[PDB]
Amino acid sequence: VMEELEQGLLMQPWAWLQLAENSLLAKVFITKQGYALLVSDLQQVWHEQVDTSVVSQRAKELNKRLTAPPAAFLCHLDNLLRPLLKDAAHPSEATFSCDCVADALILRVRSELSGLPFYWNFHCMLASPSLVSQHLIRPLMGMSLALQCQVRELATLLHMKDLEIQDYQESGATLIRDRLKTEPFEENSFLEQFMIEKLPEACSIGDGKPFVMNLQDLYMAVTTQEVQ
Amino acid sequence: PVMEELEQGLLMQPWAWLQLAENSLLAKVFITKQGYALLVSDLQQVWHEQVDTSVVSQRAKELNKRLTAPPAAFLCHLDNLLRPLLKDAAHPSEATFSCDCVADALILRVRSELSGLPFYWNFHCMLASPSLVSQHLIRPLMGMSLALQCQVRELATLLHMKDLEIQDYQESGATLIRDRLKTEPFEENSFLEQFMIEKLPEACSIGDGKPFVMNLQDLYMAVTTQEVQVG
């Protein structure tokens, strides 16, 4: 139960949330026994794990007039949230708002179910140092190392290709098209040029959209490997 | 001004590896004549300690019990003892490091033989604030990841250009003297899948954090400098 939810949250990819001009990065894991949520804004990380009793109590308090078993509530919440997180630009039906309490965060979600209002509230406390570390720092660390290894392998491939180009040029005919000529690859020169020119835009985090849009698969793979 | 300078110096400072007692940590310290700042971690928790001259003198007197020196000289000697050890490993600095994770706070004890005489210090680092740990580890790391992804994309497009040139050479009716050097066409999808299947388990491993300080410091420096320049 608890371990199941923790593992499901760990092995989930980050998703982008837009709400009242604000942006957030959210990971969600729903199950019949409860749900786990981890939200962040690149400055603070909040985590909330809720079981059957808490979800039932909160649903009764919020939806005064929605009598249903907690499992059905969890299933409906999953059906409402998962498609939105997975793909952006989805038909706008789930409105979100965030209230930043002095310590906690209140995420209010209002949606439509068969034309009827449906309210829910996530009361997220500040994430524990261990959870935030395990969810962001170590996985990001692994992705950085894996990308460094990828760059090294691609540099080796470029060295092989440059050697073979030199072999062709040493004993070969002229080029049918002269516009396809390429200069020899230098790792130091390429690194310096990239750092001087395109690092300011390449490393621009912004609001977190590029991170979720670009390299979520690597994050998922690194987290799955770390699990084992 | 002193606090802002300390924060900026700490932010610009890179990470270093400190093997102390049957364990190791990632440390980042910036010491100036008016105080110092320290950020330590073990990849699970982050502790931070910003310290000024008055408490420096107080704690130095509480610990040494026989040394009377101005706080500026004490900080200068502490920097002289620490920086060479951080910069390179296996440095015979005669510095002994111990850690005590008492309650939530962390006590990092440093002992040395200053010109053949005892010298003690203690860092009473508290749990790092959520904003500080974020700005120091999360944002720079993800900026590094994005920069490396852009580097990989650049390498892939350069591979594509080289492959186009190679196809042109082949179509030009030219034959290689030796086929032992022949290379096959490169595909981004195939290479990515092969790498993920084969080398990802070994590359993604962080262990105690040594590979990061060994290989991913210059990019960290550049990303942090860009971030501070932006705001």
Curated annotation (Swiss-Prot), chain A:
Effect recorded for residue 80 to P? In IMD124; uncertain significance
Q: Which GO terms describe its biological process?
A: B cell differentiation; central nervous system development; double-strand break repair via nonhomologous end joining; immunoglobulin V(D)J recombination; positive regulation of ligase activity; response to ionizing radiation; T cell differentiation; telomere maintenance
**Listed result of changing residue 204 to A:** In 6A mutant; abolished phosphorylation; does not affect ability to repair double-strand breaks (DSBs), possibly because of redundancy with XRCC4 phosphorylation sites
| Mutagenesis or variant effect for residue 41 to A/P | Does not affect ability to participate in V(D)J recombination
- Describe what happens upon changing residue 38 to A: Does not affect ability to participate in V(D)J recombination
Q: What is the effect of changing residue 183 to A?
A: Does not affect ability to participate in V(D)J recombination
Q: Does the keyword Ligase apply?
A: no
* Outcome of substituting residue 118 to A: Does not affect ability to participate in V(D)J recombination
The tissues in which it is expressed are: Ubiquitously expressed.
Q: Where in the cell is it found?
A: Nucleus; Chromosome
Task: Cite the GO molecular-function annotations of the record.
Answer: DNA end binding; DNA polymerase binding
Q: What is its main location?
A: nucleus
Per the UniProt entry, the effect of residue 112 to A is:
Does not affect ability to repair double-strand breaks (DSBs). Does not affect interaction with XRCC4
Q: Where is this region: Globular head?
A: 2-136
Per UniProt, the keywords (alphabetical) are: Chromosomal rearrangement, Chromosome, Coiled coil, Disease variant, DNA damage, DNA repair, DNA-binding, Nucleus, Phosphoprotein, SCID
**Which GO terms of the cellular component aspect does the record hold?**
DNA ligase IV complex; DNA-dependent protein kinase-DNA ligase 4 complex; fibrillar center; nonhomologous end joining complex; nucleoplasm; nucleus; site of double-strand break
Annotated phenotype, changing residue 27 to A: Abolished ability to participate in V(D)J recombination
Instruction: Describe the PTM.
Output: Phosphorylated by PRKDC at the C-terminus in response to DNA damage. Phosphorylations by PRKDC at the C-terminus of XRCC4 and NHEJ1/XLF are highly redundant and regulate ability of the XRCC4-NHEJ1/XLF subcomplex to bridge DNA. Phosphorylation does not prevent interaction with XRCC4 but disrupts ability to bridge DNA and promotes detachment from DNA.
What's the effect of swapping residue 175 to A?
Impaired ability to repair double-strand breaks (DSBs). Does not affect interaction with XRCC4
Q: What result is annotated for mutating residue 139 to A? A: Does not affect ability to participate in V(D)J recombination
Q: What is the effect of changing residue 116 to D?
A: Impaired ability to repair double-strand breaks (DSBs). Abolished ability to bridge DNA. Abolished ability to participate in V(D)J recombination. Abolished interaction with XRCC4
Q: How the protein assembles, per its UniProt entry?
A: Homodimer; mainly exists as a homodimer when not associated with XRCC4. Interacts with XRCC4; the interaction is direct and is mediated via a head-to-head interaction between N-terminal head regions. Component of the core long-range non-homologous end joining (NHEJ) complex (also named DNA-PK complex) composed of PRKDC, LIG4, XRCC4, XRCC6/Ku70, XRCC5/Ku86 and NHEJ1/XLF. Additional component of the NHEJ complex includes PAXX.
> Which disease does its entry mention?
Immunodeficiency 124, severe combined: A form of severe combined immunodeficiency (SCID), a genetically and clinically heterogeneous group of rare congenital disorders characterized by impairment of both humoral and cell-mediated immunity, leukopenia and low or absent antibody levels. Patients with SCID present in infancy with recurrent, persistent infections by opportunistic organisms. The common characteristic of all types of SCID is absence of T-cell-mediated cellular immunity due to a defect in T- cell development. Microphthalmia/coloboma 13: A form of colobomatous microphthalmia, a disorder of eye formation, ranging from small size of a single eye to complete bilateral absence of ocular tissues. Ocular abnormalities like coloboma, opacities of the cornea and lens, scaring of the retina and choroid, and other abnormalities may also be present. Ocular colobomas are a set of malformations resulting from abnormal morphogenesis of the optic cup and stalk, and the fusion of the fetal fissure (optic fissure).
* Family to which the UniProt record says this protein belongs: Belongs to the XRCC4-XLF family. XLF subfamily.
Task of the protein: DNA repair protein involved in DNA non-homologous end joining (NHEJ); it is required for double-strand break (DSB) repair and V(D)J recombination and is also involved in telomere maintenance. Plays a key role in NHEJ by promoting the ligation of various mismatched and non-cohesive ends. Together with PAXX, collaborates with DNA polymerase lambda (POLL) to promote joining of non-cohesive DNA ends. May act in concert with XRCC5-XRCC6 (Ku) to stimulate XRCC4-mediated joining of blunt ends and several types of mismatched ends that are non-complementary or partially complementary.
Put simply, this protein is called Non-homologous end-joining factor 1
- Please report the organism this UniProt entry assigns to the protein: Homo sapiens
Q: Which gene encodes it?
A: NHEJ1
Shown stretch of the complete protein? 1 to 227 of 299
